[PDB]
Design a protein around this ligand. Sequence first.
Ligand code: ATP
Ligand code: ADP
Ligand code: MG
Ligand code: ZN
Ligand code: ZN
Lengths: 609, 309, 163
Amino acid sequence: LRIIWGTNVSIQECTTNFRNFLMSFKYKFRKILDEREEFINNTTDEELYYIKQLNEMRELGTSNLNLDARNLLAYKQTEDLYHQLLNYPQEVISIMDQTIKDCMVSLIVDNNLDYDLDEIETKFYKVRPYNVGSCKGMRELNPNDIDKLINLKGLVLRSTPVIPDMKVAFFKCNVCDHTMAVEIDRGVIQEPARCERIDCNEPNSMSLIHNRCSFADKQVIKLQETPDFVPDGQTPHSISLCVYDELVDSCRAGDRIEVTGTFRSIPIRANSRQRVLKSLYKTYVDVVHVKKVRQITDQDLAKIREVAAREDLYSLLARSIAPSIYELEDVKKGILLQLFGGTNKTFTKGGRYRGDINILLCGDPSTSKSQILQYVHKITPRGVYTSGKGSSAVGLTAYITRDVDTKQLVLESGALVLSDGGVCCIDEFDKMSDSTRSVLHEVMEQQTISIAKAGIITTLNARSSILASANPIGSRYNPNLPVTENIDLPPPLLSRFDLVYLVLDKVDEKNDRELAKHLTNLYLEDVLPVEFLTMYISYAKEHIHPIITEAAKTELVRAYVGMRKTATTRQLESMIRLAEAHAKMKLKNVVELEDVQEAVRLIRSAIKD
Amino acid sequence: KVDDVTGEKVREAFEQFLEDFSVQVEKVYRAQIEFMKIYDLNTIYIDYQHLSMRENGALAMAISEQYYRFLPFLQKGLRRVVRKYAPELLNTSERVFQISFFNLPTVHRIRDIRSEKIGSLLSISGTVTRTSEVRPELYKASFTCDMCRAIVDNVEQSFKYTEPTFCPNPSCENRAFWTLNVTRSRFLDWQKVRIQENANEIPTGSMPRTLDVILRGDSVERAKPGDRCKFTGVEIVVPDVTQLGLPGVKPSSTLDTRGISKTTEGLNSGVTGLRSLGVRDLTYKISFLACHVISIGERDQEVFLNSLS
Amino acid sequence: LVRSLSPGDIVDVTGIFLPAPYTGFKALKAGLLTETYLEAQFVRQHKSLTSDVEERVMELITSGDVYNRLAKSIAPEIYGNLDVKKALLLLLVGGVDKRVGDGMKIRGDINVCLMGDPGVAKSQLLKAICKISPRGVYTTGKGSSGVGLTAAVMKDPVTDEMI
Ligand SMILES: Nc1ncnc2c1ncn2[C@@H]1O[C@H](COP(=O)(O)OP(=O)(O)OP(=O)(O)O)[C@@H](O)[C@H]1O
Ligand SMILES: Nc1ncnc2c1ncn2[C@@H]1O[C@H](COP(=O)(O)OP(=O)(O)O)[C@@H](O)[C@H]1O
Ligand SMILES: [Mg+2]
Ligand SMILES: [Zn+2]
Ligand SMILES: [Zn+2]
């Protein structure tokens, strides 16, 4: 009957229409609405999409809804709310929450169970509508749609810390020490005039207790117009976004998001002291829904086990990591062994012993090493792909820098620290400067980086693995001259790399034809897992820790001695790491003869080059 | 004057905890008070786990939720315990006492700081990146009326220089024009430290978040830049005192050298209405106040033989 | 009338020429000096798939000698270097950009470098090619930094925030 002042929305019909919508709607009505042909009605027409989500939310206890606009328009009688929400979002959403308040009761007592409902009474619910209408950029927003729901798209530039907002004031009397709480409306606090206590009753005896009030959380986000839609010779524009309650700390910096929210405009004061305002408002949006652009199940465990039970797991993931790369199977073997890494240990007396494998690729200038590095970048969970051509001498480690937004101090870690526990890929290793090289030296020796600047003395943790690619001086790597002259790298730096591979390119008719054939076949338009590798890698790296047995002793000692029939002691610690990394593959819990045989074969084929 | 009933229950419960715990019968807290008496110390240490077994957490959760309002009663009960068992620790050469809590069950990161824990007892962890000088803070002020020469003492101050209002015992009428007796007033040590998030809690791409932690009393200089420290205390909120009418003309109504953010111009919700503010708008920001700090990241024969067992 | 004007347009704008109040700060020093502005009321800018363009391509096909004529008409002032003009045409068009599965990508864009002794019409040829395609930028030496200026900081005077 009665209508909220100003608008035309009435609660009475809206509540009834919404309950009819929820208990009545199914995928049947949705597929009748869209009816785009080839629409599946296989038992979906009776699934009762809303009621099942309602029940699963009740049993979970979480309050999150994804009501859509097209689905809201689907029902004939509730079509009024579709055009009644775009123009008055706040009141319709207030009705929304009020109806969801008893949507719980409508289903908890259908069978008269023993749910408490008291925690349901205390907790509140809300909705997150999306796909309200056609998406329009910030470059087309008039004052004609203020306080109306819109959908925007843009790049996230920055976020601000949590902002307190007062809800309930708290005043204490300095004479009688009486406490009373005053609600605030739209920001303004209505001051208490005199103490309510009739006996006390003193004028001007009020004191505000700042830390005894009640506060809520706010966040402000900054967006930028996407470069695709901008026209020629223009500068991108910006919009500020208000985020409240559960949605705070959701949008990371640099992401691109599409949001739904209410456009709004407020005045800003001309003079700081005076009451005066200037005749030009500022425009922003209050957001209600945000969209962007571990915990493996038991079935995943079973499929991992059965795949691990394969006869030849080595070759399959040898070919999977680099589908495009043809031949070069040996370097892929080495990279597959590197991605697991030997076990890591730190006993009290001896100290920490390294368990990371370092690989250097070098050779003729027009092979495919860069694509190989960009392949291994994606597979590994946490890693960084940055070239060593330039940048700061401590660009891979901590660099104390002045903050840009605030005139303060921030400690920013580098790329080696940010690749902790993973594989760090370095490109153009030969162009890295003589002064920054020493930094890597402390990374590959002690696995820690120390910074002592601006009154800060501290140490970080590197614990990463280095895969690097380099280029020689000239157009070919002539085998006659030894490695040292061509690669332009210090002998210790080359020596400390666990595996060094030489990629050669010789004019061979068979090889040239075979390469060109599959290259053209790839350009011609006509056994590789997609994400199994990442989960298998995580499982092997986070749960599995092999050990060494005397069977490895017998082979390892005699193999090292036979290699000593100019193999430094580094060689044996390289064989142990490779053998223990192979043991982590073909899932096991202990090393045997096969692992040490594969490791020695790999390290001697490396010697052959 | 209006008094509280829950505060009285907390005050008596704390006295009972101090007097009765004795679990090792050793009277561990009475042993600590005796050690303070003999060594002339000014701070006590209370473990949370020790308190986590009396009243099945009824006292512990009550203290944790509303530490800010219950601290005055805890200190009042401690005063009575000290008077009953060790009067020597009641006067100096009175010692402003401090209570240090530690061993909380769960630890928080800097990105879990929300306004709904303001006033609660928490523990946080972070890496220190800046420390300041040990400045003296005004604790108990003392003034003299210009005309009567009457002396007022123990004028509490919250966040700004507060002088008394209504004059003392005579007929004299006076609203202002006091003279601080800097000699009679009590002072305390004050330090501000800046901390940021740890290297592991930082996401893959992130600009680290920061916080302002206030160390006071005996806790000064215990956190050094570059170290990783675990703080514990109470989460508070600090207003902007410049627009609260500071006495001097030196503030000059928010003199600035850099330009404020236009994005948050009018977006930062400021409350108005109060008479002290006038037509101004008061703003708030979240800071931390710490009571206990821990770190998580002599060739003389006679003195050497003393330390060893 | 809003949004009728965009940066980089030569236009003839009509309106009322009015004095701004110049009040607030720095008004006292001026005293009787005022700003000014123009309230705009009219705009006169000085300067697709349809059957017309469907027939233009057919006409050019019937013309014949498309390759040689297209190469030749490029900068008719300069006489010679006809093979260079053939190659600039291939640069104007673009090769296939095919997105291969599993992450592989192949480029279809053209990279053409023109070396040679000074005073051979080096730097008219280039400028002339910029006219043909609307999407093109002529970047020069260290006088200005635009090739690698993918900066994330912009001290715009209007608001003093980063862009
Ligand atoms: N084939 C040609 N046809 C016509 N004019 C030519 C030709 N070759 C050179 N020119 C002349 O050369 C000039 C255009 O090139 P210009 O010498 O100005 O620049 P550039 O070749 O980039 O050399 P620089 O190194 O001096 O900048 C004009 O004077 C033009 O008449
Ligand atoms: N073995 C190969 N398999 C597939 N493509 C190859 C191979 N060798 C060379 N290529 C081709 O040559 C190019 C190599 O470029 P790249 O290796 O990234 O440069 P860089 O020499 O700087 O590492 C790639 O575009 C790739 O298509
Ligand atoms: Mg020239
Ligand atoms: Zn009162
Ligand atoms: Zn007086």
